Amino acid sequence: KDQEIKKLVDQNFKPLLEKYDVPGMAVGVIQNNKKYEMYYGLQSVQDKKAVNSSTIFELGSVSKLFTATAGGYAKNKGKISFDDTPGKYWKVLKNTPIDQVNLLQLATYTSGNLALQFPDEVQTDQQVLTFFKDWKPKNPIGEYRQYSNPSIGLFGKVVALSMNKPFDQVLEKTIFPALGLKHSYVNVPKTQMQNYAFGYNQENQPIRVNPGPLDAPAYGVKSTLPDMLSFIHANLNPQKYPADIQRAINETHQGFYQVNTMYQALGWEEFSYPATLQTLLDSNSEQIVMKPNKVTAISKEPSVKMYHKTGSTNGFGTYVVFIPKENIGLVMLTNKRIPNEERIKAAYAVLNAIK
Numbered sequence: 001k002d003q004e005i006k007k008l009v010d011q012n013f014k015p016l017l018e019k020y021d022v023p024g025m026a027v028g029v030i031q032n033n034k035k036y037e038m039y040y041g042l043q044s045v046q047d048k049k050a051v052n053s054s055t056i057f058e059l060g061s062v063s064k065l066f067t068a069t070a071g072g073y074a075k076n077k078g079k080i081s082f083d084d085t086p087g088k089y090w091k092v093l094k095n096t097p098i099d100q101v102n103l104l105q106l107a108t109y110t111s112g113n114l115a116l117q118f119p120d121e122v123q124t125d126q127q128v129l130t131f132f133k134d135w136k137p138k139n140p141i142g143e144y145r146q147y148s149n150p151s152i153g154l155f156g157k158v159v160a161l162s163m164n165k166p167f168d169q170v171l172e173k174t175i176f177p178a179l180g181l182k183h184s185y186v187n188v189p190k191t192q193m194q195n196y197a198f199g200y201n202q203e204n205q206p207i208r209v210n211p212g213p214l215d216a217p218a219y220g221v222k223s224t225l226p227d228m229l230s231f232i233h234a235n236l237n238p239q240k241y242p243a244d245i246q247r248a249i250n251e252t253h254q255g256f257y258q259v260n261t262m263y264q265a266l267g268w269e270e271f272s273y274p275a276t277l278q279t280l281l282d283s284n285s286e287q288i289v290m291k292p293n294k295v296t297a298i299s300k301e302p303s304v305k306m307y308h309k310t311g312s313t314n315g316f317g318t319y320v321v322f323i324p325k326e327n328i329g330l331v332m333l334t335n336k337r338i339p340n341e342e343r344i345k346a347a348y349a350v351l352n353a354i355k
């Protein structure tokens with residue numbers, strides 16, 4: 001029965017490579033602290049290099065999980081409080097309208113007036129500052145969730161400002177080593193560029209992520225399948241890790257509000273387990289992802305929970321999910337975007353067949 005792990009992924013994930021012309025895919029599964037690694041296709045079409053345990057993928061919005069873990073690390077260490085405001089750390093924002101939104105509201109996209117991306121005009125560091133200086137409120141603060149890169153991006157910058165280090169160093173020198181990650185980078189070094197996969201757009205043209213405003217805390221992490229399986233293992237068994245990172249992980253497993261059947265935790269999206277397939281798919285619907293939605297208090301606190309998160313760049317797709325009481329998790333990494341529903345459906349079929 002331990003061999004069906006390899007067989008179940010070939011039935012549900014492998015057909016997606018041909019269906020959407022995906023050059024490479026890496027699917028990992030952890031069950032009872034045992035890791036399974038399945039690699040498909042090529043990380044580089046022109047180089048005919050196959051996807052392996054060293055292939056580096058762009059995590060996209062799954063990077064937000066590491067930003068949330070970084071915030072939980074600073075909160076437990078006393079460097080921040082979720083009730084603090086960004087002006088306390090970014091001094092030029094003090095008394096500005098954005099200084100009325102606390103850090104927890106920035107991390108959970110409830111500022112009331114922040115869209116999915118920065119405007120196209122916002123590029124340089126000065127233009128990022130001018131954006132949050134001129135920021136005016138719209139919806140009542142804390143009442144409307146709108147999935148936003150600027151929101152959690154500012155949250156990550158404040159976390160970095162409270163740790164007296166730039167954000168990329170916070171992850172690479174503190175968070176990643178605390179999680180046991182060996183090849184996770186905000187900036188991929190030259191000695192690892194041969195492992196950095198090419199992404200592929202809808203025309204199957206090789207591409208990689210471009211520099212952008214607050215790109216690192218919003219979508220700037222690149223990682224490998226063994227590292228992401230270690231990150232899942234850390235989320236499944238935080239009590240096995242040192243106290244500083246363990247309490248950081250626990251900070252990301254607490255829902256703060258609901259939107260229909262989705263509980264918004266720190267970075268992670270939380271659901272009552274067992275969850276229906278449509279519940280997980282609804283989290284990635286256009287209504288939940290692109291539009292504002294009024295939030296409600298957590299009424300039913302689920303005793304048995306599950307967590308997932310989709311992430312995408314222009315040429316990469318990502319999906320991670322784990323179930324603590326089943327001690328099972330899955331990671332999908334692809335060097336071409338496939339519909340979010342397809343990633344969730346395939347992982348839903350794999351997890352339910354392994355009890």
Ligand SMILES: *[B]([O])([O])C1=[C][C]=C(C(=O)N([C])[C][C])[C]=[C]1
Pocket residue numbers: 059060061062116117118149212218219310311312313314
């Ligand atoms: B994500 O939720 O994986 C995500 C969506 C969009 C962006 C973005 O702003 N850009 C420009 C990259 C496509 C990042 C992450």
Ligand SMILES: [Cl-]
Pocket residue numbers: 090091092093
């Ligand atoms: Cl300042």
